[PDB]
Design an enzyme around this catalytic site. Structure first.
Site, PDB file in Angstrom:
ATOM      1  N   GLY A  23       0.807  -1.223   0.000  1.00  0.00           N
ATOM      2  CA  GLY A  23       0.000   0.000   0.000  1.00  0.00           C
ATOM      3  C   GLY A  23       0.836   1.268   0.000  1.00  0.00           C
ATOM      4  N   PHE A  27       2.427   9.330   3.784  1.00  0.00           N
ATOM      5  CA  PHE A  27       3.582   9.063   4.645  1.00  0.00           C
ATOM      6  C   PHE A  27       4.741   8.402   3.886  1.00  0.00           C
ATOM      7  CE2 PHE A  27      -0.230   6.500   5.472  1.00  0.00           C
ATOM      8  CZ  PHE A  27       0.133   5.257   4.967  1.00  0.00           C
ATOM      9  N   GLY A  28       4.424   7.317   3.174  1.00  0.00           N
ATOM     10  CA  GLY A  28       5.383   6.554   2.373  1.00  0.00           C
ATOM     11  C   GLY A  28       4.762   5.291   1.793  1.00  0.00           C
ATOM     12  N   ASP A 141      -7.836   5.452  19.116  1.00  0.00           N
ATOM     13  CA  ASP A 141      -8.238   5.205  17.725  1.00  0.00           C
ATOM     14  C   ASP A 141      -8.624   3.742  17.498  1.00  0.00           C
ATOM     15  OD1 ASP A 141      -8.886   5.893  15.086  1.00  0.00           O
ATOM     16  OD2 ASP A 141      -6.802   6.096  14.416  1.00  0.00           O
ATOM     17  N   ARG A 145     -10.802  -1.144  11.511  1.00  0.00           N
ATOM     18  CA  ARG A 145      -9.732  -0.827  10.549  1.00  0.00           C
ATOM     19  C   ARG A 145      -8.352  -0.914  11.210  1.00  0.00           C
ATOM     20  NH1 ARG A 145     -12.320   3.972  11.743  1.00  0.00           N
ATOM     21  NH2 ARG A 145     -11.004   5.299  13.083  1.00  0.00           N
ATOM     22  N   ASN A 146      -8.310  -0.799  12.544  1.00  0.00           N
ATOM     23  CA  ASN A 146      -7.043  -0.787  13.281  1.00  0.00           C
ATOM     24  C   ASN A 146      -6.767  -2.060  14.082  1.00  0.00           C
ATOM     25  OD1 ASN A 146      -6.326   1.697  12.259  1.00  0.00           O
ATOM     26  ND2 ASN A 146      -7.220   2.843  13.973  1.00  0.00           N
ATOM     27  N   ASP A 159      -1.983   0.562  14.961  1.00  0.00           N
ATOM     28  CA  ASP A 159      -2.145   2.013  14.746  1.00  0.00           C
ATOM     29  C   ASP A 159      -2.136   2.799  16.051  1.00  0.00           C
ATOM     30  OD1 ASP A 159      -4.153   4.043  12.417  1.00  0.00           O
ATOM     31  OD2 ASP A 159      -2.644   4.621  13.902  1.00  0.00           O
TER      32      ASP A 159
HETATM   33  C1  LIG Z   1      -6.782  -2.474   5.768  1.00  0.00           C
HETATM   34  C2  LIG Z   1      -5.738  -3.244   4.953  1.00  0.00           C
HETATM   35  C3  LIG Z   1      -4.444  -3.425   5.697  1.00  0.00           C
HETATM   36  O1  LIG Z   1      -4.366  -3.091   6.875  1.00  0.00           O
HETATM   37  N1  LIG Z   1      -3.407  -3.988   4.936  1.00  0.00           N
HETATM   38  C4  LIG Z   1      -2.348  -4.621   5.636  1.00  0.00           C
HETATM   39  C5  LIG Z   1      -1.638  -3.913   6.590  1.00  0.00           C
HETATM   40  C6  LIG Z   1      -0.608  -4.503   7.297  1.00  0.00           C
HETATM   41  C7  LIG Z   1       0.083  -3.775   8.260  1.00  0.00           C
HETATM   42  N2  LIG Z   1      -0.193  -2.413   8.539  1.00  0.00           N
HETATM   43  C8  LIG Z   1       0.846  -1.510   8.922  1.00  0.00           C
HETATM   44  C9  LIG Z   1       0.521  -0.444   9.736  1.00  0.00           C
HETATM   45  C10 LIG Z   1       1.495   0.444  10.156  1.00  0.00           C
HETATM   46  C11 LIG Z   1       2.817   0.267   9.786  1.00  0.00           C
HETATM   47  O2  LIG Z   1       3.808   1.146  10.207  1.00  0.00           O
HETATM   48  C12 LIG Z   1       3.790   1.081  11.643  1.00  0.00           C
HETATM   49  C13 LIG Z   1       4.444   2.286  12.246  1.00  0.00           C
HETATM   50  C14 LIG Z   1       5.438   2.102  13.183  1.00  0.00           C
HETATM   51  C15 LIG Z   1       6.041   3.206  13.744  1.00  0.00           C
HETATM   52  C16 LIG Z   1       5.617   4.451  13.340  1.00  0.00           C
HETATM   53  C17 LIG Z   1       4.617   4.540  12.399  1.00  0.00           C
HETATM   54  N3  LIG Z   1       4.017   3.485  11.837  1.00  0.00           N
HETATM   55  C18 LIG Z   1       3.182  -0.792   8.984  1.00  0.00           C
HETATM   56 CL1  LIG Z   1       4.872  -0.975   8.551  1.00  0.00          CL
HETATM   57  C19 LIG Z   1       2.183  -1.655   8.558  1.00  0.00           C
HETATM   58  C20 LIG Z   1       1.078  -4.445   8.942  1.00  0.00           C
HETATM   59  C21 LIG Z   1       1.808  -3.801   9.976  1.00  0.00           C
HETATM   60  N4  LIG Z   1       2.323  -3.304  10.900  1.00  0.00           N
HETATM   61  C22 LIG Z   1       1.334  -5.764   8.658  1.00  0.00           C
HETATM   62  N5  LIG Z   1       0.689  -6.474   7.735  1.00  0.00           N
HETATM   63  C23 LIG Z   1      -0.280  -5.838   7.064  1.00  0.00           C
HETATM   64  C24 LIG Z   1      -0.992  -6.534   6.104  1.00  0.00           C
HETATM   65  C25 LIG Z   1      -2.014  -5.939   5.392  1.00  0.00           C
HETATM   66  O3  LIG Z   1      -2.741  -6.627   4.431  1.00  0.00           O
HETATM   67  C26 LIG Z   1      -2.083  -7.817   3.999  1.00  0.00           C
HETATM   68  C27 LIG Z   1      -3.064  -8.564   3.117  1.00  0.00           C
HETATM   69  C28 LIG Z   1      -7.566  -1.606   4.790  1.00  0.00           C
HETATM   70  N6  LIG Z   1      -8.267  -0.452   5.362  1.00  0.00           N
HETATM   71  C29 LIG Z   1      -9.310  -0.075   4.413  1.00  0.00           C
HETATM   72  C30 LIG Z   1      -8.975  -0.773   6.593  1.00  0.00           C
END
Ligand SMILES: *[C@@H](CC(=O)Nc1cc2c(Nc3ccc(OCc4ccccn4)c(Cl)c3)c(C#N)cnc2cc1OCC)CN(C)C
Length: 307
Positions: A23, A27-28, A141, A145-146, A159
């Protein structure tokens, strides 16, 4: 109060490989990949966030503060930060959660989600939140979604971008301005910017409602600016079709105006756990008994077994 002795691990960029984009935000970019610590003969599935070059000093600060928070938590129902990497832009390495966010998961798999799963997820999120309460952390939060799905049987809270560690003597966090998820927030948070563990309980009730409706939008079609007066008039989210009054009364209790009258997370663990022992008595889902969800390279090891 107690010294925070969490370790923050700084990783080497050559130790992890980006395999596929997951994704892209402001942010990045988040990648799916592998972390391969040198000489350890182990490969850990990870999500890697790489910040873009255009990231402001302010944004970097907030990302590092969130990292600080994630490094300070250690519980099977809270996401784990593996470490960070200080390249040109900062990279953040988290445990991969292959089934993604729980909101999407329930929307996409609703014809196969039975009562056992739904109630187990309620227990697990309550455990994650109770742990955060023990750590004097207010999440601010909580929402479907989180929550991330490691397996259909195991979910974890994520999150921490709004999370606050309460000050030593502090009972409530007082916020300032900002962009807020109104429809998940306790009335005292919307009106007065006050946040407590009991305000997280409100958000938990809304999260449960999201799950029980298989990912409906709360107060759908109602503008956020009308929420606070709707709530003040005593109106709440409706009983989901699958919920017995037992389950609905628990959500309703999370939405009391008196924060101290809301259940405690430790009691939510207990109540949902009683229901998880006889799930078809508490949730009424057609074809429940025939519903099934998925269940489990050479040197791959999950982050949870890498200690
Ligand atoms: C929901 C779809 C979705 O969540 N897709 C994901 C996401 C992950 C994530 N998410 C994630 C979140 C934050 C991250 O950064 C963390 C951070 C640390 C320090 C400071 C700031 N931010 C990162 Cl690197 C990832 C993770 C994690 N953690 C792991 N695996 C995921 C899988 C995934 O889908 C895989 C199929 C859609 N919305 C519509 C609700």
């Amino acid at each position: 109060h107690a010294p925070n002795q969490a370790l923050l691990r700084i990783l080497k960029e050559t130790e992890f490989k980006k395999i596929k984009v997951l994704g892209s935000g402001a942010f990045g970019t988040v990648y799916k990949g592998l972390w391969i610590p040198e000489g350890e003969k182990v490969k850990i599935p990870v999500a890697i966030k790489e910040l873009r070059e255009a990231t402001s000093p302010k944004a970097n600060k907030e990302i590092l503060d969130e990292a600080y928070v994630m490094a300070s938590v250690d519980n099977p129902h809270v996401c784990r930060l593996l470490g960070i990497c200080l390249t040109s832009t900062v990279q953040l390495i988290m445990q991969l959660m292959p089934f993604g966010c729980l909101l999407d998961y329930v929307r996409e798999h609703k014809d196969n989600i039975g009562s056992q799963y739904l109630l187990n997820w309620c227990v697990q999120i309550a455990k994650g939140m109770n742990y955060l309460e023990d750590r004097r952390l207010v999440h601010r939060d909580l929402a479907a979604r989180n929550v991330l799905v490691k397996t259909p049987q195991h979910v974890k809270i994520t999150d921490f971008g709004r999370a606050k560690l309460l000050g030593a003597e502090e009972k409530e966090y007082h916020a300032e301005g900002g962009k807020v998820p109104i429809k998940w927030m306790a009335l005292e948070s919307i009106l007065h910017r006050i946040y407590t563990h009991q305000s997280d309980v409100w958000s938990y009730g809304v999260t449960v409602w999201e799950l029980m409706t298989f990912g409906s939008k709360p107060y759908d079609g109602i503008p956020a600016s009308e929420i606070s007066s709707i709530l003040e008039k005593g109106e709440r989210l409706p009983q989901p079709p699958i919920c017995t009054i037992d389950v609905y009364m628990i959500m309703v209790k999370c939405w009391m105006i008196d924060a101290d009258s809301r259940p405690k997370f430790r009691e939510l663990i207990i109540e949902f756990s009683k229901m998880a022992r006889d799930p078809q008595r508490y949730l009424v889902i057609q074809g429940d008994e025939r519903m099934h969800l998925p269940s489990p390279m050479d040197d791959v090891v999950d982050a949870d077994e890498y200690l």
